[PDB]
Design an enzyme around this catalytic site. Sequence first.
Site, PDB file in Angstrom:
ATOM      1  N   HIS A 146      94.544   5.892  72.038  1.00  0.00           N
ATOM      2  CA  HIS A 146      93.494   5.933  73.027  1.00  0.00           C
ATOM      3  C   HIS A 146      92.451   6.896  72.594  1.00  0.00           C
ATOM      4  CE1 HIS A 146      91.595   6.876  76.914  1.00  0.00           C
ATOM      5  NE2 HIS A 146      91.930   5.634  77.202  1.00  0.00           N
ATOM      6  N   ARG A 223      80.918  10.840  84.567  1.00  0.00           N
ATOM      7  CA  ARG A 223      81.042  12.171  85.057  1.00  0.00           C
ATOM      8  C   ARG A 223      81.310  13.031  83.878  1.00  0.00           C
ATOM      9  NH1 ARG A 223      86.905  13.133  84.931  1.00  0.00           N
ATOM     10  NH2 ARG A 223      87.942  11.103  84.797  1.00  0.00           N
ATOM     11  N   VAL A 226      87.659  16.531  81.915  1.00  0.00           N
ATOM     12  CA  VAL A 226      88.401  17.758  81.775  1.00  0.00           C
ATOM     13  C   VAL A 226      88.398  17.916  80.297  1.00  0.00           C
ATOM     14  CG1 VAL A 226      90.754  18.646  82.057  1.00  0.00           C
ATOM     15  CG2 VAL A 226      89.824  16.992  83.688  1.00  0.00           C
TER      16      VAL A 226
END
Lengths: 350, 358
Positions: A146, A223, A226
């Site tokens: 990923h 957005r 993290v």
Amino acid sequence: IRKVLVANRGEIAVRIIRACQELGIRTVVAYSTADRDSLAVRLADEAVCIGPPPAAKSYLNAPALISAALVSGCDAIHPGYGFLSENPYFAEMCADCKLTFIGPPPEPIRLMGDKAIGRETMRKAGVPTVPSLEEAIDVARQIVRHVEIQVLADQYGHAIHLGERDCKIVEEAPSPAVTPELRERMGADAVRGIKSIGYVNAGTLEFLLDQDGNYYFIEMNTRIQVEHPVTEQVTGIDLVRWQLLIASGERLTLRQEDIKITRHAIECRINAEVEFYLPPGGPGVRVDSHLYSGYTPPGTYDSLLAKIITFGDTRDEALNRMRRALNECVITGIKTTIPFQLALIDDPEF
Amino acid sequence: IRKVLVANRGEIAVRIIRACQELGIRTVVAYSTADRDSLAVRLADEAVCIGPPPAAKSYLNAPALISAALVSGCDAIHPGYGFLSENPYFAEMCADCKLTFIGPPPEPIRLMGDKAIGRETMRKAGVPTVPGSDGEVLLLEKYLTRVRHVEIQVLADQYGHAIHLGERDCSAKIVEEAPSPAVTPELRERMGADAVRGIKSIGYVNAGTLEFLLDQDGNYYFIEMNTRIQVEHPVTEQVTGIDLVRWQLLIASGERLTLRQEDIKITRHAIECRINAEEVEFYLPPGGPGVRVDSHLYSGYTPPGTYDSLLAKIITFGDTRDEALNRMRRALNECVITGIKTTIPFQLALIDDPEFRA
């Protein structure tokens, strides 16, 4: 942009306050009854209590957040990651009430809100995406890590890519399976797509990676993530400050030639009173946290306590610097995820 | 190197332990009775009390330190900065007792130890020196007023290869910066070349820093040399990408400096504030983007007064000098050192003083 309302908590709250302060932007923070004793309240110039300890009552309540901006004189609101960042209603309301939402325009958020629509929006862009009974056999005779791509854009049409990160407990940039050439290709398609949907600010498109190096788009996050500090370490770019600047109406003076990956970085998330907190430090360490000694963590929201990001010139240099920094991070009084992460870094398979 | 003894106390010791750990090296710390409560004792693999709170009794006792190394399995001794870092004897003494001084040879230590001899040795090596006494008179030099204090980091190996890793404006030492606002890229290459040859002439190995003075018209004049690591070193490592303490330990293991000069570029702008003392009940270092904190402080630490005033070193960086100074202001308004007074408020004032900024 003169004064910002931070409508998040924790690390991301401290990180937005740090960005603002480095740019001369005053800060008011939005907190719940549970987050009164946050470092963000101390670090920020001003603070407003928007609601009760539950989130729907507080952080996910837009009317309260807009009211806070208004009582405080804030001209912009930073959504953060999570919560109302990818909510297109909040964005619209910020605009209706004449506040600048630091983020993408409402429409790109909606298109990418549904994964399916997004995959199709990107297929239309030309971004690669995942590949009658009889028709079905025929389709079958013609037919994963990923990896996430960072993008950033202006209100004027310039967008750039800031590379890839590999995935969530540990995130590393650069990907250990990505050649410079693929990254460039993966990124261009992404920049092109964000441009197709008319994207403004920072965002991240997730892709799935094949044995052979073929990439397929999955989702886009409109957005900040993290996982941003790892990209920054490798590229030398303050993404959060750039969001504030773009929202200000400024141009992206950066270009693709300018952006290059120079180091290898890995981020580990430390998750669950912190009677004692000694962060790590020294060469090659970045600690993004809201912790302090004497902190009784509220359990109403997350697990996250700290984010240690170690860099190096090699992957093993960075992995060995995390070794040290995770045996130096002294979060006492609470059990943490540091012990597990130490095992992972030295997992032979890792 | 299998195991090193850290012969110093404080922030510094944690630096060497940190570096050693990154390189797989075992660390034993040597502590005074006063320094048992230190973080270094926690961070370190093993610990040896080498003596009482006075330095002569403890940290200047080469016999205690050598013995400690031997008893603990240490094969190397990092003298740190200060103390016996530039004592020629401790280096020799380490060799005779089969230990590795993590530093220069005993004679480049000795020549450079006397400033007068140092000025002279470097004059004969082609480096410009300050107009003054040729030898000793105490030494006399002229008072240069319109000059800035700039210093060149040198790293060298046992095989005769040496590189400079740039300059550091040590002017203001409570504050240090890199790059210097007066040193142009060419001058860095010129000044550093003079430094590299000088150290090659003296036969240097390991890290050292040649200190110069720079006139209004851009000309340099050598004044001093520290044959050790400096408190001012984190700043360069942040503009160059090179770990200076790691390389020290490597040079002494007998490894070659694989860095050509082409490979060293000052690409950032860093700056460092020493927070001094002028029980820490609450310690909270700054962090975030652009901050590196080198300290031994902890919430609960009772700083001894005995050896220094230093509590912490905050180093901020950025692509611009003001980017560097603005991340510092934040870092300094974020550092909470409570229970002891500090120098932070004076640092925040200077960073925002008009002259400094210009």
